[PDB]
Amino acid sequence: HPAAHGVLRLVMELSGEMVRKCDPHIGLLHRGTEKLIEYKTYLQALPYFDRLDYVSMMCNEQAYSLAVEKLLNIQPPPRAQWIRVLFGEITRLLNHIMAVTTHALDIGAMTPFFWMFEEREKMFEFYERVSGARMHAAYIRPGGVHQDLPLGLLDDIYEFSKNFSFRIDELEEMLTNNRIWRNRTVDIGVVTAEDALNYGFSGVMLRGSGIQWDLRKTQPYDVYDQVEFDVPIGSRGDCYDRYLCRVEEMRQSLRIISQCLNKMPPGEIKVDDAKVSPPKRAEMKTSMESLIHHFKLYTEGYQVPPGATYTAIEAPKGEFGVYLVSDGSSRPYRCKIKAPGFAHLAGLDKMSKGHMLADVVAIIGTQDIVFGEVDR
Amino acid sequence: ASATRVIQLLRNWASGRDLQAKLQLRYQEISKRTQPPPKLPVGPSHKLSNNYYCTRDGRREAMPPSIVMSSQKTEKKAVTPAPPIKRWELSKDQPYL
Amino acid sequence: LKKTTGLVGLAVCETPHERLKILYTKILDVLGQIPKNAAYRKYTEQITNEKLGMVKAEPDVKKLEEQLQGGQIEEVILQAENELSLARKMLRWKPWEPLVEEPPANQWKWPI
Amino acid sequence: QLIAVDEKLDITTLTGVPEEHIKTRKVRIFVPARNNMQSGVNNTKKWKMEFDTRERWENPLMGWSSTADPLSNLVLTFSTKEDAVAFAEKNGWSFDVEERKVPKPKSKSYGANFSWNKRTRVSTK
Amino acid sequence: TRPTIRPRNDVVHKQLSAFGQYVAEILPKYVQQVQVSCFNELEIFIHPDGVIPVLTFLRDHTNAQFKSLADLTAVDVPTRQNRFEIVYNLLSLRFNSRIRVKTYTDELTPIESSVTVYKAANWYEREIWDMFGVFFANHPDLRRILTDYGFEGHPFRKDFPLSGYVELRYDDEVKRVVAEPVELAQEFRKFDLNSPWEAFPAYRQPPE
Amino acid sequence: GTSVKPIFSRDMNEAKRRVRELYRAWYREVPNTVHLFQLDISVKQGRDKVREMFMKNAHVTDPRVVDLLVIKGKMELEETINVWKQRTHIMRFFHETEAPRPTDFLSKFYVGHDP
Amino acid sequence: TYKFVNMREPSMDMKSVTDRAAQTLLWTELVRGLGMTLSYLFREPATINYPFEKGPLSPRFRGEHALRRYPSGEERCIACKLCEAVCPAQAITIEAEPRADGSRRTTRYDIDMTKCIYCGFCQEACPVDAIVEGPNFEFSTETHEELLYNKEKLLNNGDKWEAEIAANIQADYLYR
Amino acid sequence: GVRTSPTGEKVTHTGQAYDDGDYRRVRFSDRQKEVNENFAIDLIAEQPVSEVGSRVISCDGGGGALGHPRVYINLDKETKTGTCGYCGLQFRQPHH
Amino acid sequence: SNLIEVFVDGQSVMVEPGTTVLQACEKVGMQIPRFCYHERLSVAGNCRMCLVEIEKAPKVVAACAMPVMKGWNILTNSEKSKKAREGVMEFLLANHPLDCPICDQGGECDLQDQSMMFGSDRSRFLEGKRAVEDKNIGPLVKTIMTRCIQCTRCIRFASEIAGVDDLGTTGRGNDMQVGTYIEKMFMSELSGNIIDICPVGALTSKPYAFTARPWETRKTESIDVMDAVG
Amino acid sequence: EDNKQFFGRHRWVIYTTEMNGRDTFWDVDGSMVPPEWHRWLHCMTDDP
Ligand SMILES: CCCCCCCC/C=C\CCCCCCCC(=O)O[C@H](COC(=O)CCCCCCC/C=C/CCCCCCCC)COP(=O)(O)OCCN
Ligand code: SF4
Ligand code: SF4
Ligand code: SF4
Ligand code: SF4
Ligand code: FES
Ligand SMILES: [Mg+2]
Ligand SMILES: [Zn+2]
């Protein structure tokens, strides 16, 4: 179904077009990722986090890298952290464009999708220049980043960033004040603050209901404590408030990107510790220790001291977490992945009480669901 | 750019903005596809002296978790996990959209 | 006086001082039925007594909110009701008793 | 409330393993031998459970190594031999256990290399 | 020790240790152990019978207020007599903190469903049941969530094989999709990577 | 002793009662299943298969294991009734595309190395 | 630090009321949306004339795999098997033996292109720059078997794409 | 160094050609067999041996960081030549 | 009885008189890094990788040769021990060839593993490396002498276990080399064992050359039938 | 090329009508570009 947003089988009980019951059946994209991770080394498991939520690739890489770095007791260098925050905000732009335009497309407003996907294409080009891939980059690694930025990337990121606000403005002209859009979005899928907290909601699904919580502000990571931005807050807990929150979050991401462009420091890009991060190729081809460490890091991988962590980030879809258990070897013993879409879809049935079919379509759109992270 | 001025005027009037100022197609202001070679600075551990690895070994400073209250083994003011959060401030930049 | 608590589903409270006093008195009454040497009773009594004193000493709602550190007195009321419900549950559960069972010797041993 | 069940533990009907892979399988419970190419002993600390080797053949295309054995890769790690035996028993697998082999304590003496009348004296150094 | 080593935070460590002591004193009936990890994460190891009380306390206490259940999962450790380790992750917005609660069970012992305490658990407990086979008592609607209809066994269990026992293919004679015993063109190649030399002296176990 | 906690039944009698109830429910469901899924089997075949699946686990003597088996059978029944299952899932019980594997020594010796 | 997105109150003056009545009855914001679409109608489309025009790429782009040689024509690969060890998809299969002149060379080098995730970890792991992901991306096949590459196919890819692969490596190796 | 088998099939650098009674040759009928024509063993056998006036020489395959890891080759044996274990190039001291 | 009490990292243990520091550390389950010590060969003490600090002693001792003294407190993880291991690994790797991708010892190398575990992660050696000519000791044991770390395990095994005095060291200092000095085939029914005990890729199996890597192999513990020893 | 076109439309190829053996008057595809012109055409470099 076009409105399904992936391989989702939603079983509904209907009286006329009124929805009496929603039963989301998932698992049509369960690939058994966590067992597979248990069969890999820590570097081999990284590309799985690209494919969990395929619209926020580097954010998932960052969450996993933070978990592994916390377990390794090491620290990424400052330039790497600035690169991580910059590309996390670019990724948030990508995700919010995808969410807003696919929501509008379900509702029926097909045009803004085509306007915004050219911008998405320009950001895919940024991804590709840095890593050689437009989507599953695998750029963020448990030691920093894989490669330094190419010699003219910052200028192009600046050129893109100084035009994007007008595209957001055109989107808002299309949608924000349209009476049809407001009729399809205002007072649809209203959730109270206490219900949102109890059901496990996070991100926009909290902020639309007035709860003042953003993980970048409350539990900052990387260099998020050094950037300035506002957190959008809703008033009514409906789809209109969440749409406004996402648009304003796009604007605040532009703000953060400008700050990151003007504040990128020099230095190395991965932790200067060759028992965790691979050495440079010239060193690998000149020095005995560098060659030994390259060999061992690419065959066996680094060992992680025993212990378990729960690391969470403010991914564009909500709180994204990893419960990572190390038994002391170079392979993870356990990796549980916490995806906000799981709880949001588990609450979809609650949010659709007393609504019609089209309202349920709008609610699925407003929950910002990608089933790679839901099923794993 | 290529478009005749009258079409530019019609575009500006319909959109309500000066379209030419912020064109969405990259005409010539982007970086060249060929660049000079880089040099890339070395890390802090690239010293030739006073660089013993045992003084910069983060993996070996991890320890097993500290045990509080094993079961197998004064007023006492009540405590909390952390101090209460401070209330947020209302965005001196733009408080209301 | 104040409109829009700001949280969806949380109504604005008229007369919040009286509600808070009633709730804290009920909480202390319930705690009075717990054994005096139980840690839950003394801790909850201490915090409840401080909050009740703060409510009694501050007639102003915004100044009281800033003193209580509880985030918008309607939330303080909700938390008081939550604590009262928990107090009744703890009375029924009696978690101050000695540990029910001791786990196997290698149950929490990690790694392996 | 406790009901005082009297029988041996048995979970085969709940695991979902096909009966062929429950009755005809033999597991080995053992401490793996030290790899003779190295001196480290860190891989000889825990007990291992592993299944019997089944048929592997050649793929007609590409000549890869094909198997039809779903348990050909499964290795379990245990703290003690008793835990491994209990796991195998409750899962219904026939097992063979091997007692742990440790290197015997050896009497070393550097000075013996230079014995006045003994055969131990080194001809070279 | 400066540039490449993760910095410490002793203030948060002290606060979490004190709060763990607080929780242990308030609920001696269930709390078996309290730990503060080196990177400031607080874990409370309890008895299974105290799943519902502990969590309820941690959700409703004025000094606790962990009103959000971030995650709930299981870990399989076959060497333990109680195979499965149930892990609850809770977040407090009022105090901007996180807590972990751990308990244990085996194959035949149910755990109390905590849907009443947290609505979020519903799908988490269904997922634990599906992947590990841990039954949850008094669950509103307990059934498989991730696996295929009619799928036998629990995939996340350590004993279960990585590629399972059956595969699917379309068969033209019966004109439908059929399930058959797994055959692999190329077998997954098992690697032995563990180094025979010890990496971390701080975690060395006694020689028994 | 042995200090175990039950799921539903305290002894084998209650577990057998639950088994009988689940068997009744499956027996009643079989004709509706044959009608709804448009299966080419008879109702007799379906009830025979239900009996065979029940008898696969006749050797169980633990009330907790029996309780879990009844829970799984109830899960499967709920799944079948609501049509979550498709015709392929129902027909997976009959193994219609699986060639019969022999059990005597000589045929096994002829085909390959597996016992 | 937060802002409100929907906490604004409407003016109640007669002028404001008449403007809102005009908006309701004469559909002003709908004409605004029509104007936006009409504006986009007169812009130049962002479409490119494929296959004549191509999308921009980078020297770091990961494409079809290739096995390279030294300038002498000798293969670079020495069968260290690091690419096979690092591959997260287990897409690489390697068999090696001493060559007739005693050289350490492969006798089997397969990449299953329908297992591969195109991560580029193998070219990072290779210590002699033997395995690369070349720039090509237009290699769709009509059968599944054509995507199971052996050593001959990969050596042919290297021979076919060396001119561009060397120029791509020269432009990026100082970042590696 | 290509050469055909008695069946007309090209023999690869590896040396594998399907046998006369091997059915697998049917996979090439109506199609072709992929064979790389530049045999590395033959191409490296054409390179001239480098003469150097030192007992120990160094090889990195050329190109600096674009070659292989740098190795040192002893050249004391005069009955043979020093061969790089990475690139296959040969070195000798001026003899006779 | 005759047992004496010594401490490994402040922990008491009872050992027989004449027990070396290495064996006492092994009693508590700690393995001292080694290259030249083999518990079935005579003690050499040459590699110097086993140097450890004894409490209240300024000089590190060689754990593989030094007998424990009553009341001693070994300190296997002190700064002095770690710096000793780092320096000895540095001297070992100074002249070692960059041969890991072509070395059969690759994933099974004690030198590699102990470099990863106890050594530094970098080189500050800026000179040229030494290179030595290869020896031919028969069709079973491949020889790549540049890789030799001069442990002398092969010499002690051949002299003491095999009963042959064909192996030795010629020259001295940096130029000291392990070999036979003449064209000789080290042929004996126990010869192949010098491949196992050699910690580096200097001595490798000629039949096994280049065919496999250790991480891909599956291990089946079995018995030999080539004779009646089993 | 035409540098006044926007990025993407500033470089293009008019394919040959006769490749190795097949008629390519209508049947063209991107795989007919040789690697050096492939590098120039996909804007991996500025130098033809
Ligand atoms: C002297 C005596 C004179 C007599 C009086 C004459 C003056 C009359 C003044 C008033 C005339 C108003 C006529 C308009 C009728 C509809 C107005 C209206 O209220 O409709 C809107 C909604 O109508 C719409 O907006 C339509 C939505 C769909 C729009 C589709 C495309 C938009 C139209 C494009 C241009 C139209 C061109 C039409 C002319 C074509 C030429 C034949 C109401 O809906 P809501 O805003 O949701 O509020 C009501 C409930 N609270
Ligand atoms: S690109 Fe990645 S998946 Fe593909 S062969 Fe290389 S390492 Fe394996
Ligand atoms: S391609 Fe490179 S990494 Fe792979 S086996 Fe050959 S030399 Fe080793
Ligand atoms: S012996 Fe070990 S360190 Fe030396 S080249 Fe071989 S693998 Fe590398
Ligand atoms: S060849 Fe091996 S065993 Fe012999 S001295 Fe050298 S490193 Fe030691
Ligand atoms: S092991 Fe003691 S000196 Fe070598
Ligand atoms: Mg050896
Ligand atoms: Zn070379």
CA of I205 to the centre of ligand 7 (A): 8
The phi, psi pair for C109, rounded to 5°, reads -80, 125
**Ligand that lies nearest to the alpha carbon of residue I62, given by its number in the listed order:** 6
CA distances A109 to A2, A57, A178, I132, Å, are 14, 27, 11, 76
- The closest of A48, E53, B4, H65 to C87, measured between CA atoms, is E53
Q: Among the residues of chain F, which ranges form H helices?
A: 12-36, 43-55, 63-81, 87-91, 105-111
Query: Within 13 Å and on the Cβ side, how many CA atoms surround F98?
Result: 16
Residue count (chain A):
376
- E135:F92 CB<8 A: no
Q: Out of I94, I112, I213, whose CB is closest to A292?
A: I112
CA distances G20 to A174, G13, G24, Å, are 19, 11, 6
Q: Out of B25, B26, B34, whose CB is closest to J47?
A: B34
* F-proximal residues of A, 21-80, CB under 8 Å: 25
Nearest CA distance, D4 vs chain F (angstrom): 5
H84 is annotated as contributing to ligand binding: yes
Burial of H31: CB neighbours in 10 Å, binned 0-12, 13-18, 19+: exposed
Interatomic CA distance for residues F31 and F47, integer angstroms = 9
**Chain B: partners with 3+ C-beta pairs within 8 Å:** A, C, E, G, I, J
Interface C–E counts its CB contacts (< 8 A) at 85
- The closest of I142, I136, I178 to I158, measured between CA atoms, is I178
What is the 3-state secondary structure of chain D?
A: CCCCCCCCCCCHHHHCCCCHHHHCCEEEEECCCCCCCCCCCCCCCCEEEEECCCCEEECCCCCCEEECCCCCCCEEEECCHHHHHHHHHHHCCEEEECCCCCCCCCCCCHHHHHCCCCCCCCCCC
Interatomic CA distance for residues A142 and E6, integer angstroms = 13
Residue nearest to atom 8 of ligand 3 (CA): G80
Interatomic CA distance for residues I93 and I96, integer angstroms = 5
What the block records as the tokens of A329 is 């070897």
What the block records as the tokens of I184 is 């000789």
What is the 3-state secondary structure of D110-123?
A: HHHHHCCCCCCCCC
Task: For residue I153, give the ligand 5 atom closest to its CA.
Answer: 3
What the block records as the tokens of E83 is 């195979």
End-to-end CA distance of chain C: 61
CA of G26 to the centre of ligand 1 (A): 5
A317, A371 Cβ separation under 8 angstroms: no
Interatomic CA distance for residues F56 and F93, integer angstroms = 13
- B40:G5 CB<8 A: no
**Ligand that lies nearest to the alpha carbon of residue G154, given by its number in the listed order:** 3
CA A344 to chain centre: 15
- The closest of E93, B89, B78 to C75, measured between CA atoms, is E93
Burial of G136: CB neighbours in 10 Å, binned 0-12, 13-18, 19+: buried
Task: Locate the DSSP E strands across chain B.
Answer: 66-70
A82, A53 Cβ separation under 8 angstroms: no
Q: Out of I16, I159, I196, whose CB is closest to D36?
A: I196
The SS3 assignment for A13 reads strand
Residue count (chain E):
208
What the block records as the tokens of E103 is 């308990």
Nearest CA distance, E48 vs chain D (angstrom): 14
Interatomic CA distance for residues A118 and B17, integer angstroms = 20
Greatest alpha-carbon span in chain C: 61
Residue type, C9: G
The phi, psi pair for A106, rounded to 5°, reads -65, -45
B94 contact residues in A (CB cutoff 8 A): 230
**Tokens 């070897």, residue?**
A329
Interatomic CA distance for residues I54 and G103, integer angstroms = 49
Residue count (chain J):
48
What the block records as the tokens of H43 is 């191409």
DSSP annotation of A270 reads B
Task: For residue I51, give the ligand 6 atom closest to its CA.
Answer: 2
User: If you measure CA to CA, which chain G residue comes closest to H70?
Assistant: G128
Please give the domain boundaries of chain D with CATH numbers for all domains: 19-113 (3.30.160.190)
Q: How many CB atoms lie within 10 A of CB A232?
A: 27
Interatomic CA distance for residues C59 and C7, integer angstroms = 24
Resolution of the solved structure (Å): 2.6
What is the 3-state secondary structure of A278-327?
A: CCCHHHHHHCHHHHHHHHHHHHCCCCCCCEEEEEEEEECCEEEEEEEEEC
F65, D5 Cβ separation under 8 angstroms: no
DSSP annotation of A216 reads H
**Tokens 């190829």, residue?**
J13
End-to-end CA distance of chain B: 34
Interatomic CA distance for residues G77 and G75, integer angstroms = 6
Handedness of CA A154, A155, A158, A163 (dihedral sign): negative
What the block records as the tokens of G2 is 């937060």
DSSP annotation of A275 reads T
- The closest of I225, I218, E192 to D54, measured between CA atoms, is I218
Interatomic CA distance for residues A148 and B41, integer angstroms = 10
- B63:E202 CB<8 A: yes
Residue nearest to atom 6 of ligand 3 (CA): G77
The domain that holds G134 is classified in CATH as 3.30.70.3270
Instruction: Give the gyration radius of chain A's Cα atoms.
Output: 21
C88, C30 Cβ separation under 8 angstroms: yes
E16, E96 Cβ separation under 8 angstroms: no
The phi, psi pair for D25, rounded to 5°, reads -95, 150
Strand pairing partners for H32? none
- The closest of A135, A68, A90, A36 to A370, measured between CA atoms, is A135
CA of G67 to the centre of ligand 2 (A): 13
Ion ligand 8 nearby residues (CB, 5 A)? H 59, 61, 84, 86-87
CA of A254 to the centre of ligand 7 (A): 59
Which domain range does residue G146 map to? Answer: 65-175
H96 is annotated as contributing to ligand binding: no
User: If you measure CA to CA, which chain G residue comes closest to J27?
Assistant: G51
Which domain range does residue H79 map to? Answer: 41-92
- The closest of F97, F62, A309 to E42, measured between CA atoms, is A309
Picking from D62, D64, D67, D73 by the largest number of G CB atoms within 10 A of its own CB, the best residue to mutate is D62
CA distances C42 to B77, C45, C69, J12, Å, are 9, 5, 21, 81
Angle subtended by helix axes G14-26 and G28-41, to nearest 10:
60
The alpha carbon torsion through C52, C57, C60, C63 (nearest 10 deg) reads -80
Strand pairing partners for E169? E178
Interatomic CA distance for residues E34 and E44, integer angstroms = 5
CA of G105 to the centre of ligand 3 (A): 10
User: If you measure CA to CA, which chain F residue comes closest to A11?
Assistant: F84
Query: Within 13 Å and on the Cβ side, how many CA atoms surround A22?
Result: 25
Phi-psi domain of G38 (left: phi exceeds 0; alpha: psi -120 through 50; beta: other)? alpha
Angle subtended by helix axes C61-68 and C39-57, to nearest 10:
150
Angle subtended by helix axes A78-107 and A164-175, to nearest 10:
30
Strands I141-143 and I73-75: unpaired
Interatomic CA distance for residues E32 and B72, integer angstroms = 8
B96 contact residues in G (CB cutoff 8 A): 3-4, 7-8
Chain G contact for J14 (CB, 8 A cutoff): yes
CA of I83 to the centre of ligand 5 (A): 25
Interatomic CA distance for residues A24 and B44, integer angstroms = 53
C43 contact residues in B (CB cutoff 8 A): 78
Which domain range does residue F53 map to? Answer: 1-115
**Ligand that lies nearest to the alpha carbon of residue I115, given by its number in the listed order:** 4
Task: For residue G125, give the ligand 2 atom closest to its CA.
Answer: 7
Experimental method used, please?
Answer: cryo-EM
| Cis status, amide bond into G51, omega within 30 of 0 | yes
Chain A contact for H67 (CB, 8 A cutoff): yes
Residue among G95, G123, G128, G151 to mutate when testing ligand 3 (max atoms within 8 A of CB): G128
CA of G87 to the centre of ligand 2 (A): 5
DSSP annotation of A134 reads S
Interatomic CA distance for residues A306 and B63, integer angstroms = 9
I105 is annotated as contributing to ligand binding: yes
Residue among I198, I204, I205 to mutate when testing ligand 5 (max atoms within 8 A of CB): I198
Contacts of residue A250, defined as CB under 8 A and 6 or more positions apart, other chains included, come to: A92, A93, A96, A97, A168
User: If you measure CA to CA, which chain G residue comes closest to D65?
Assistant: G93
Angle subtended by helix axes I79-94 and I110-118, to nearest 10:
140
Contacts of residue F101, defined as CB under 8 A and 6 or more positions apart, other chains included, come to: none
- D16:E185 CB<8 A: no
The domain that holds H76 is classified in CATH as 2.60.260.40
Strand pairing partners for H92? H51
Interatomic CA distance for residues H89 and I61, integer angstroms = 46
User: If you measure CA to CA, which chain D residue comes closest to E80?
Assistant: D83
The alpha carbon torsion through F62, F67, F68, F74 (nearest 10 deg) reads 150
Burial of E163: CB neighbours in 10 Å, binned 0-12, 13-18, 19+: middle
Residue type, I7: F
- B30:A159 CB<8 A: yes
The count of structural domains within chain F is 1
- B78:C99 CB<8 A: no
Contacts of residue D61, defined as CB under 8 A and 6 or more positions apart, other chains included, come to: E185, G145, G148
